Amino acid sequence: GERVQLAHHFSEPEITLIIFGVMAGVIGTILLISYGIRRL
Amino acid sequence: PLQQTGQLFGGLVRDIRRRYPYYLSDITDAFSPQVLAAVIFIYFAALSPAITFGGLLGEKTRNQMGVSELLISTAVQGILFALLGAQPLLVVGFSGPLLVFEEAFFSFCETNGLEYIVGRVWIGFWLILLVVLVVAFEGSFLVRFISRYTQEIFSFLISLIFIYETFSKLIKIFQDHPLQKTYNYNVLMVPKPQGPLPNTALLSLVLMAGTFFFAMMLRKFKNSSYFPGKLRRVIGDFGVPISILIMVLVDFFIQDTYTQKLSVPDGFKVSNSSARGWVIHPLGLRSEFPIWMMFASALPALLVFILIFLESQITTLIVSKPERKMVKGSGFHLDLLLVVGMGGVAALFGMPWLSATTV
Amino acid sequence: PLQKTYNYNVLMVPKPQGPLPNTALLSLVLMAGTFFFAMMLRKFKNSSYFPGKLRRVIGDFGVPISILIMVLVDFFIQDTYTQKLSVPDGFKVSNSSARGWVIHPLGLRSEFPIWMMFASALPALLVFILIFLESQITTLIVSKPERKMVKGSGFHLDLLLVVGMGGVAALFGMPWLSATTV
Numbered sequence: 049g050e051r052v053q054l055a056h057h058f059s060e061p062e063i064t065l066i067i068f069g070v071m072a073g074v075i076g077t078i079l080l081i082s083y084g085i086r087r088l
Numbered sequence: 089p090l091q092q093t094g095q096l097f098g099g100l101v102r103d104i105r106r107r108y109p110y111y112l113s114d115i116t117d118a119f120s121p122q123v124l125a126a127v128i129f130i131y132f133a134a135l136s137p138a139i140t141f142g143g144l145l146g147e148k149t150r151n152q153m154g155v156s157e158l159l160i161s162t163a164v165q166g167i168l169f170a171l172l173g174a175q176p177l178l179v180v181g182f183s184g185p186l187l188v189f190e191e192a193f194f195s196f197c198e199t200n201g202l203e204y205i206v207g208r209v210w211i212g213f214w215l216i217l218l219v220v221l222v223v224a225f226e227g228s229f230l231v232r233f234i235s236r237y238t239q240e241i242f243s244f245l246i247s248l249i250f251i252y253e254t255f256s257k258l259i260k261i262f263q264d265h266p267l268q269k270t271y272n273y274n275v276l277m278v279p280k281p282q283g284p285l286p287n288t289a290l291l292s293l294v295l296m297a298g299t300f301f302f303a304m305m306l307r308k309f310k311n312s313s314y315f316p317g318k319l320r321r322v323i324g325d326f327g328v329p330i331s332i333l334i335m336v337l338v339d340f341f342i343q344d345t346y347t348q349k350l351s352v353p354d355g356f357k358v359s360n361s362s363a364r365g366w367v368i369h370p371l372g373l374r375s376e377f378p379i380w381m382m383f384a385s386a387l388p389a390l391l392v393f394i395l396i397f398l399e400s401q402i403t404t405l406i407v408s409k410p411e412r413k414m415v416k417g418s419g420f421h422l423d424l425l426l427v428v429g430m431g432g433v434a435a436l437f438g439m440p441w442l443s444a445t446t447v
Numbered sequence: 448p449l450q451k452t453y454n455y456n457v458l459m460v461p462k463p464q465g466p467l468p469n470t471a472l473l474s475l476v477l478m479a480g481t482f483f484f485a486m487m488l489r490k491f492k493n494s495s496y497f498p499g500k501l502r503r504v505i506g507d508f509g510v511p512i513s514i515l516i517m518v519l520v521d522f523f524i525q526d527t528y529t530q531k532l533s534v535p536d537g538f539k540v541s542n543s544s545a546r547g548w549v550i551h552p553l554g555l556r557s558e559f560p561i562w563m564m565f566a567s568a569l570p571a572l573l574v575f576i577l578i579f580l581e582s583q584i585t586t587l588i589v590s591k592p593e594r595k596m597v598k599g600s601g602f603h604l605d606l607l608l609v610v611g612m613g614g615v616a617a618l619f620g621m622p623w624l625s626a627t628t629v
């Protein structure tokens with residue numbers, strides 16, 4: 049980045065991949081729940 | 089196009105199958121001077137508000153987001169929306185309500201001692217999830233309930249706001265350089281004049297009036313019965329570039345008098361290097377980001393999504409009316425998804441989110 | 448002219464001896480505004496807005512309304528100087544030393560030459576030609592049948608009156624006139 053930044057355990061690509069994976073999991077769970085309804 | 093199919097992501101696929109077959113025509117139909125004239129028109133009509141909004145945002149947010157970041161975000165989002173969008177006629181850029189929300193969020197973060205740019209990153213992260221959920225359930229079918237009533241009211245209000253701001257900028261210019269009997273001839277000019285200057289406000293008024301008069305006269309000449317028809321249409325299409333060139337040349341030969349010009353950053357760099365870089369860490373730049381704010385950013389993200397959704401969908405309704413002879417179709421779901429996704433991605437890089445501006 | 452710097456100490460009586468800021472630009476703005484308001488009110492006369500009687504009343508008074516509006520606009524701008532109308536203080540001759548109200552045909556300071564009295568016919572012929580052409584062409588223009596003139600025009604009477612009034616005013620040291628076209 050720029051100047052001095054606080055060190056983190058997860059790097060920026062790592063943390064953004066983790067966030068995208070969590071978001072994709074939430075989206076998949078919501079889609080599966082919606083697919084469950086309107087059928088039974 | 090506003091019907092509810094009942095299938096997951098059905099609206100997106102319908103918009104894709106409606107628009108992408110016309111992709112080959114979308115390149116060949118631009119072989120006309122009217123397209124080039126429209127390019128010249130929209131270049132200024134999008135650059136000048138972008139420069140003004142970037143300057144105001146840099147002043148209000150301590151240059152955390154400024155002119156350069158806004159210009160880069162506008163360029164990237166416009167390129168992606170032109171390459172992949174369903175209604176390329178829409179112009180993607182910053183707007184006033186977005187500036188108000190940015191100021192409010194900056195004030196909130198300053199009061200609570202939170203990193204505002206990381207808060208924007210989390211807001212964009214929530215925006216991506218919100219738009220994916222909306223597109224998945226075909227949430228853009230509710231736009232069919234917006235009749236001509238609301239569309240025309242919004243368009244008239246936005247036009248009145250635009251005209252009022254245009255006149256208020258001239259009023260502010262007149263206030264900065266009032267008409268006085270005497271002036272100080274030794275006034276520093278860098279970066280801006282610190283005192284009133286002679287002939288500034290009057291020349292600005294003259295240039296604005298001349299630009300408006302030439303634009304209106306050339307628009308009338310487009311519909312007039314003078315000159316051969318082909319040359320008449322060529323001149324009428326390039327009426328705005330011709331007026332801009334004429335007034336710029338007129339101001340150019342007046343060397344002594346000072347008029348405010350366009351200001352752009354020297355290079356492609358962040359507005360404030362100390363505050364942030366090109367990539368902003370979602371976990372925090374200077375201090376560790378609080379856990380609670382990551383979940384609390386949804387409500388500001390909800391407000392941003394509501395603003396962008398209403399603006400883009402009403403603009404698409406206005407530009408895709410059947411009376412305007414739109415014979416290619418418009419995709420609401422694809423355009424909304426692309427706009428909000430590009431905003432969320434640009435939030436990660438410390439760039440402002442945009443919307444389909446009406447004007 | 449438009450200059451970066453101006454002298455703030457310039458004498459104004461009788462006229463400004465040096466350039467002044469915001470003068471020419473404000474004059475251009477006032478002229479453009481007057482022309483724009485006059486044209487807009489002329490179009491409003493023929494427009495379909497407002498009740499017809501009030502529309503015609505406003506359209507007829509379009510020039511006075513524009514003049515009043517621009518005069519009021521310039522009035523509230525106290526600091527900037529604009530050139531105004533100048534009229535003499537009273538009903539008096541411009542130069543008292545040169546002549547009075549009645550000029551003696553035999554001479555004021557020196558005896559008038561005899562030959563010039565007969566030689567003045569050719570300048571009088573040129574003046575008569577100028578006034579005749581101007582007045583008669585103006586009468587032709589204003590009395591065209593396509594202009595719906597249903598009262599008639601008299602060329603001989605108007606020409607006689609104009610040239611006679613000019614000749615009489617020449618005696619009192621006043622300029623001769625003509626029927627101007629504009």
Ligand SMILES: CCCCCCCC(=O)OC[C@H](COP(=O)(O)O[C@@H]1[C@H](O)[C@H](O)[C@@H](OP(=O)(O)O)[C@H](OP(=O)(O)O)[C@H]1O)OC(=O)CCCCCCC
Pocket residue numbers: 315316317318
């Ligand atoms: C610098 C220009 C060239 C100078 C050289 C001077 C020599 C010169 O310019 O004559 C060529 C040409 C005459 O050809 P012509 O009169 O047939 O051209 C018609 C004209 O273009 C109309 O505008 C067209 O109608 P519209 O618009 O489509 O509805 C019409 O097409 P259509 O609909 O009837 O089928 C055309 O036929 O000029 C003019 O256009 C007349 C205006 C000349 C004005 C004076 C020139 C400015």
Ligand SMILES: CCCCCCCC(=O)OC[C@H](COP(=O)(O)O[C@@H]1[C@H](O)[C@H](O)[C@@H](OP(=O)(O)O)[C@H](OP(=O)(O)O)[C@H]1O)OC(=O)CCCCCCC
Pocket residue numbers: 497498499500
């Ligand atoms: C301040 C004005 C009064 C405010 C009070 C508001 C109350 C109010 O103003 O209504 C009275 C009057 C309605 O009466 P009305 O419509 O019958 O008046 C007709 C109108 O004057 C036309 O201009 C005339 O045609 P033209 O010109 O001669 O060819 C026509 O005469 P004719 O040829 O058919 O025989 C007239 O009949 O108003 C209007 O004129 C409509 C425009 C209102 C516009 C809104 C008012 C500006």
Ligand SMILES: CC(C)CCC[C@@H](C)[C@H]1CC[C@H]2[C@@H]3CC=C4C[C@@H](O)CC[C@]4(C)[C@H]3CC[C@]12C
Pocket residue numbers: 066067070071213214217379382383
């Ligand atoms: C809406 C999208 C962004 C997903 C919803 C956000 C929530 C559920 C997730 C996404 C990313 C997550 C964070 C990812 C990484 C860490 C670092 C770890 O040491 C503590 C938890 C913490 C801080 C997580 C907290 C919960 C979190 C913020």
Ligand SMILES: *[C@@H]1O[C@H](CO)[C@@H](O)[C@H](O)[C@H]1NC(C)=O
Pocket residue numbers: 150151360362363
């Ligand atoms: C950049 O941010 C710092 C605080 O981190 C601030 O003091 C400075 O004024 C900012 N730069 C500009 C140009 O405002």
